[PDB]
């Protein structure tokens, strides 16, 4: 579900927040994104690329 913050857990990486569409071109084996605070910024769905 989108446009609402929910407790997500992608490939063991858990957290809470909204999952919105992204325009960041992730190269083939990109899996997780990290910000300056080492927090998760973007994730790749293992089912849908």
């Amino acid at each position: 579900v989108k446009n609402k913050c929910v407790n997500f857990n992608f490939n063991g990486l858990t957290g809470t927040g909204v999952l919105t569409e992204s325009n960041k071109k992730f190269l083939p084996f990109q899996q997780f994104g990290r910000d300056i605070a080492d927090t998760t910024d973007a994730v790749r769905d293992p089912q849908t690329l």
């Binding site: 300056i36 605070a37 080492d38 927090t39």
Partner: protein
């Protein structure tokens, strides 16, 4: 003469403040310092 000198000096001050960026440094650095401090705090979230 005093009026002309005052107007020309105000024009020179305008030119200096519009041409010299470092003339604002004594303020900008302060913000930078704060920002720097904040950044350090954020970086301290990466330590184990």
């Amino acid at each position: 003469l005093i009026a002309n000198q005052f107007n020309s000096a105000i024009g020179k001050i305008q030119d200096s403040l519009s041409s010299t960026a470092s003339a604002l440094g004594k303020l900008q650095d302060v913000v930078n310092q704060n920002a720097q401090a904040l950044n350090t705090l954020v970086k301290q979230l990466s330590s184990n």
